[PDB]
Design a protein around this nucleic acid. Structure first.
Ligand SMILES: [Mg+2]
Ligand SMILES: [Mg+2]
Ligand SMILES: [Mg+2]
Ligand SMILES: [Mg+2]
Ligand SMILES: [Mg+2]
Ligand SMILES: [Mg+2]
Ligand SMILES: [Mg+2]
Ligand SMILES: [Mg+2]
Ligand SMILES: [Mg+2]
Lengths: 138, 176, 190, 199
RNA sequence: GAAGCUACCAUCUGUGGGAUUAUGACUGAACGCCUCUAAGUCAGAAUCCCGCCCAGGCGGAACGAUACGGCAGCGCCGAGGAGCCUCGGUUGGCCUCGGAUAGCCGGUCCCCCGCGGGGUCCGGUGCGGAGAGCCCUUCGUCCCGGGAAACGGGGCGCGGCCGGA
RNA sequence: AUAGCGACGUCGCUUUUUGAUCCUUCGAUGUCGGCUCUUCCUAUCAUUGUGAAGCAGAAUUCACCAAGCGUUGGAUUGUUC
RNA sequence: UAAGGCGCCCGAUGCCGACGCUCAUCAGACCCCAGAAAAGGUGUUGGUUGAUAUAGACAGCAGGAUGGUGGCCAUGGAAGUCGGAAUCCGCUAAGGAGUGUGUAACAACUCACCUGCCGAAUCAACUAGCCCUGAAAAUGGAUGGCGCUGGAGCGUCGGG
RNA sequence: GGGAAGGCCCGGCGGGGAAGGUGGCCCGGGGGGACGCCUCGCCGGCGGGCGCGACCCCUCC
């Protein structure tokens, strides 16, 4: 079954191309594999864009199929897409990936040191729990 | 013509040189879809030589300039009247496309002609390009996009960038 | 040209229930259960509407070549529903000129033996498909009845025992002998 | 350091080209479960192609002529050989770095097998097209070990299911322990979260 | 005329399956009906492939015995002892479900069958139970303190029990 | 008209007939037949499985998958024929 | 850089290349060049022209499908159905001196045409792309090979 | 083309138009939420049901 459709007013996340990594709102469907979109608030000038480079999110905001950027921005601000996107888990994973990429060598060493303890404690406690479960089974 | 890249629309006006017979020959204007102004002028001379008794040696390009799209943010339906050469005989046709720019629609027309009839740019003679209302559209491939509540999914997304993780332990997912 | 959407819906009666796991459908009713998968069609099946009222088939972005599969899926599902609620009864008759065709049923309707087909010393032995029951019709001189729930299985058995009796090296326009499907109805009528 | 590939779902030539390049580049490659490989085009077409290959033999002495290997592993091996300069020492040394197998042998069943998305059927073929199974093609061309390898694969699958269940149980213990000890491993977690290894 | 060779000039023996071609069909759309075809399915042969049969790979397997009694040569072990010559490449490991893709993955008692398999429900889903990942992480030693551990670490240090074709 | 044929036309295929040419060979590639022996082609005479007849049966036509297996013994002639 | 190329052989697309077309049980794949035509396809994709359809079509399922008259010349027999011209009228919602099957002739069936149910698009005739039929030779065999079908094929194109 | 669009002032404001018709209205159904018909749950209570007839009584999507 399909849950994410392409209609007027859906928010999609651009994966690659000029505006890579930005949200956008679908205004119209030009053709089978091209849509007229704009990110009035995410800094993306109104333009055409292929379907091959956007990934659909589960955010819908209402405006007519050819409304101008004024009304598109009005609907975007009214629905407050930015904070909800920042709060969703998708953006959290993206932001964490960006953090890991940005990490320099000193924080790499610090992360190694912290992970050593984290794994050691977890492994010891897991051994304790496994022994306890075995004793309970016996 | 070599339909290189995306075409551009040029307004080209030309006239015969003044002669003792007539001081001021009438100026003739034409719309040329071309990669650049040089080939635009060449096509203008070709068409005007077919139409009138005019040649480049006995004429002059009074003006030649690109005409920009009037509304490049409104998706429009374009009807194109076209004249092309097959392997046996020549035919007139009318085709509709859907795009934001007249030049983009004409480029789509050239690519579609090459794909469907193996006709080449030196065979296609473009005649008329008009904005056509959705009620006046008559090709179903364009008409099916005329509704307020358009809605369709992307069913089978094929994995691109197949080579960046050239060896990956997942079998990729095609349902998003 | 690829159509944006082609859909068709099927209404199911109250006495039968339908459960689908992806593209395989299971139909359960008074006469039993029928299962059929459709992983070779690649369209969308939805059991929309509480009270299991309807089953909808969707196809997005399909040319005319695969747009035909929607109605064939719906027809297959309707046939499964019909065979589950009512069942399928294929009645066939044996036509002969001189030699009577002696048909005897064994394995409680699973094997059919045919003898004396045009003075034949050879004995035809045809096995029914699983879930198809053969019988000799009462109140009729010579006629076979095939009972089943799967229309494909019943009709395949009928075709098997029809093609088992064909004249060889003779004018088939004159030697009109063999068992032929007289009619295709249901076990019980509406 | 050896690249272990799984054949199931991969296309013959598409996988063979990548394997040949990797082998030429010096890497040791072992491809496993070759009978799961599939080829585009319908089964009758592919069987006809293999029969046409079978028909090619030296007229005067077939014993010296082309050798038509029937096992799927050897079929894949030969089509890889077709993409290497096997007449030279470099090509032969490369070809010696490749190992093919039907099923999954004991040296490799207890290992993680890699996957090549650039040669996968689900990626390279639209669903409406027809494909053929190399295992079935080989079996009805004259491979004699389709059933034995099937039973052995069934045994391997039923053992791997037990191993995977044990892995699931052990990890679930791991997660329960993690949420149990979050109290005293919290100060070790915010650093990973700030550097984006745990969010 | 022995023996031996030897003759349709004597006598004996000569095989079974599978996918399918042509063709005939089932269900069934496209195209309200129809249709062997488009998706799916069936029967099908001196053909094809294999079996039976002949050979047996710079291809493997199991098993037996493995060099005196004056010398001796050998096999296994002593985490057995120093070395000498020669051939090189390498410069951290990942010890594993099956598989789908017009769908998947993980928990669950709230139920049903034989710990496993189903049902409901709850979570994730551009895969944070991720290979775009995980694990180990090495300058060394000496004092005192805090955090984790007291069940842990190390032992051809041990004797057994299972685990594998 | 089209079971089976097919006029007046017109489009092809083959190199098992003959031509046309003269590229190789004249410090030589032994130049007709028959005998013997193997393999290959299909444009299928028979046999296996089929479809169509102006196919009642018998016989016989036309067509399809198809070269697996067979295709003889003699008079006359150096003959191929 | 030219010409030519960039899946592997084999240097170069390991571009998140663009738009389409095409399934071949003989696919196709680059000047010279190394193999094919006339004629066809309800395979599929475009295009041209003309029709009829809420005064309710196209299917499909059902009812009618009449008198003069078995029209005239005819043949042994021709009632419509082998033959020669014409083809009228009243009844009609409609019926042709007849579209076909059938008998020696009838008979009978059936069609043109009109009605009932069903309720929105449906018919043709051409034309051009790819694919398919046409398409048969001898040692086993050659888009250079492997192989390729979200193309590594065909057409138009872009960066590198 | 002294850039073509575009952005911001509800820019104000002049009139006009249909449609890929927003509300509104009419018809139809998929519904539900008040759950108004049974069944359990604790004669009064709330929660359990993953309850069960509704029907223009509305009433929302
Ligand atoms: Mg006969
Ligand atoms: Mg068989
Ligand atoms: Mg068939
Ligand atoms: Mg079969
Ligand atoms: Mg070193
Ligand atoms: Mg010689
Ligand atoms: Mg000599
Ligand atoms: Mg032949
Ligand atoms: Mg090259």
């Amino acid at each position: 079954v399909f849950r994410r459709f392409v209609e007027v007013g859906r928010v999609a996340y651009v994966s690659f191309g000029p505006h890579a990594g930005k949200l956008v709102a679908i205004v119209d469907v030009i053709d089978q594999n091209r849509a007229l979109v704009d990110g009035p608030c995410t800094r993306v000038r109104r333009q055409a864009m292929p379907f091959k480079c956007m990934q659909l999110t589960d955010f819908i905001l209402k405006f007519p199929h050819s409304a101008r950027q004024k009304y598109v921005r009005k609907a975007w601000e009214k629905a407050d897409i930015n904070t909800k996107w920042a709060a969703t888990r998708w953006a959290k994973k993206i932001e964490a990936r960006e953090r890991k990429a940005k990490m320099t060598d000193f924080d790499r060493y610090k992360v190694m040191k912290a992970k050593k303890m984290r794994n050691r404690i977890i492994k010891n406690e897991v051994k304790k729990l496994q022994r306890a479960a075995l004793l309970k089974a016996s | 013509m070599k339909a290189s890249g995306t075409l551009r629309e040029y307004k080209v006006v030309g006239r015969c040189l003044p002669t003792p017979k007539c001081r001021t020959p009438p100026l003739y204007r034409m719309r040329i879809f071309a990669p650049n102004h040089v080939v635009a002028k060449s096509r203008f001379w070709y068409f005007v030589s077919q139409l009138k008794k005019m040649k480049k040696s006995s004429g002059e390009i009074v003006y030649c300039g690109q005409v920009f799209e009037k509304s490049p943010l409104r998706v429009k339906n374009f009807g194109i009247w076209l004249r092309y050469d097959s392997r046996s005989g020549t035919h007139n046709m009318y085709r509709e496309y859907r795009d934001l720019t007249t030049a983009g629609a004409v480029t789509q027309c050239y690519r579609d002609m090459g794909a469907r009839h193996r006709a080449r740019a030196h065979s296609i003679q473009i005649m008329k390009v008009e904005e056509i209302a959705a009620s006046k559209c008559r090709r179903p491939a364009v008409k099916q996009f005329h509704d307020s509540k358009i809605k369709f999914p992307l069913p089978h997304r094929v994995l691109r960038r197949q080579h960046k993780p050239r060896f990956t332990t997942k079998r990729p997912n095609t349902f998003f | 040209m690829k159509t944006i959407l082609s859909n068709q819906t099927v209404d199911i009666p109250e006495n039968v229930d339908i459960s689908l796991k992806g593209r395989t459908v299971i139909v359960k009713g008074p006469r039993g259960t029928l299962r059929r998968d459709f992983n070779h069609i690649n369209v969308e099946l939805s059991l929309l509407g509480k009270k299991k009222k309807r089953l909808r088939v969707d196809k997005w972005w399909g040319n005319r070549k695969e747009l035909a599969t929607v109605r064939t899926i719906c027809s297959h599902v309707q046939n499964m529903i019909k065979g589950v609620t009512l069942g399928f009864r294929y009645k066939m008759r044996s036509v002969y000129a001189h030699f009577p065709i002696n048909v005897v049923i064994q394995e409680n309707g699973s094997l059919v033996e045919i003898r004396n087909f045009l003075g034949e010393k050879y004995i035809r032995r045809v096995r029914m498909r699983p879930g198809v029951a053969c019988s000799v019709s009462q109140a009729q001189k010579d006629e076979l009845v095939l009972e089943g729930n799967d229309i494909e299985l019943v009709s395949n058995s009928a075709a098997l025992i029809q093609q088992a009796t064909t004249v060889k090296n003779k004018d088939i326009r004159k030697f009109l002998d063999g068992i032929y499907v007289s009619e295709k109805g249901t076990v019980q009528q509406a | 350091q050896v690249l272990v590939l799984d054949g199931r779902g991969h296309l013959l030539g598409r996988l063979a080209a990548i394997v040949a390049k990797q082998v030429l580049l010096g890497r040791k490659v072992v491809v496993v479960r070759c009978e799961g490989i599939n080829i585009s085009g319908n089964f009758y077409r592919n069987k006809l192609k293999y029969l046409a290959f079978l028909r090619k033999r030296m007229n005067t002495n077939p014993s010296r002529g082309p050798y038509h290997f029937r096992a799927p592993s050897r079929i894949f091996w030969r089509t890889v050989r077709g993409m290497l300069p096997h007449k030279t020492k470099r090509g032969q040394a490369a070809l010696d770095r490749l190992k093919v197998f039907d099923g999954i042998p004991p040296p490799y069943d207890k290992k993680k097998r890699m996957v090549v998305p650039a040669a996968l059927k689900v990626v390279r073929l639209k669903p409406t097209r027809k494909f053929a199974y190399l295992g079935r093609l080989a079996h009805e061309v004259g491979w004699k070990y389709q059933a034995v390898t099937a039973t052995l694969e069934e045994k391997r699958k039923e053992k791997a299911k037990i191993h995977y269940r044990k892995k699931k149980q052990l990890m679930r213990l791991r997660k329960q322990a993690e949420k149990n000890v979050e109290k005293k491993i919290s100060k070790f977690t915010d650093v990973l979260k700030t550097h984006g290894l745990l969010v």
